[PDB]
Amino acid sequence: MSELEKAVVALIDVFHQYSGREGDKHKLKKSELKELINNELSHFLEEIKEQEVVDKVMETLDSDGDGECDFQEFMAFVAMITTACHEFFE
C-alpha cells in the first residue's frame, strides 16, 4: 500500500466515522460535519463554535440541497481544502 493509496483509504475512512453517527449513515448532517471539521481539520480550518458557521459551511458544500453532505460533496470539500493548502505554499 503506497502513500497515495493510504490517502484514498483515509478519506473513505474518515467520512464513515462521522456519517454513520446519526440519521442517514451515508451522509454528514450538520452536527457530524462540525465534529469532523473540529476534530480532523484542526490545523487547516478554524474550530467551528457558532451555529451560524456550521450552517454556512453546510450551505456551501450542500450542492444538491438536501441539508446534508454526501460522499460526492465530501470529496469536493476535500479538493477545496487540498487546493487551498497547495496554494498556501507559493
Among the residue ranges 27-35, 46-54, 56-64, 70-78, the one whose residues contact its own copies (CB under 8 A): 70-78
- Alpha carbon of residue 46 to chain centroid: 13
43 annotated binding-site participant: no
Query: Could you tell me the three cell numbers for 51?
Result: 451555529
Shortest CB 37 distance to its own copies, Å: 10
Q: 21: which 3 cell numbers?
A: 453517527
Q: Which amino acid is at 53?
A: V
Amino acid in the structure at residue 10: A
What is the spatial distance between Cα 22 and Cα 53, in angstroms, rounded to a whole number?
20
Stretch that binds Ca ion, among 6-14, 21-29, 47-55, 80-88 (CB under 5 A): 21-29
Q: Which is nearer to its own copies, 5 or 52 (CB)?
A: 5
Contacting positions for its own copies (CB under 8 A)? 1-14, 36, 39-44, 71-72, 75-76, 78-79, 81-83, 85-86
